[PDB]
Amino acid sequence: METVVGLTAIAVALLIGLGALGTAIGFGLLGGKFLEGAARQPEMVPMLQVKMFIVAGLLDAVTMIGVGIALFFTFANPFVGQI
């Protein structure tokens, strides 16, 4: 049984870690274009900020499916029942 419990801790770390890595690089790309666009014309900032949050919902979609499943593997455990 210790293999199933130990490999669940790694699965949780890979599932949260690969989401922490992708969201930080993915928003640093988008964020830089938002600051650049703000510098080109500060009159369009309120509109551009709303457009940035509209893309933020597509960018952080699947990374939260892994943070939810990882927090569901630390407290609950669907693999222990399967023996």
Binding site: A39, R40, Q41, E43
Partner: protein, 57 residues
């Protein structure tokens, strides 16, 4: 297309100094060409002299 930059020529500074480029002939035999021009130059220059502004030519 590029609102981020405005060249100093495209923005007005409301201060007291002005410049003029005056075009005139080299030869004579003109039926009032330079006389009517200098009359208009002096008319507009006086508005700046009276407003306290300096002039370059």
């Amino acid at each position: 297309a590029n609102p981020e930059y405005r060249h100093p020529f495209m923005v007005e500074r409301e201060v007291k100094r002005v410049g003029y480029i005056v075009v005139s002939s080299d030869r004579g035999l003109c039926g009032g060409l330079n006389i009517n021009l200098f009359k208009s130059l002096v008319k507009d220059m006086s508005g700046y002299r009276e407003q306290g502004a300096e002039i370059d030519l």
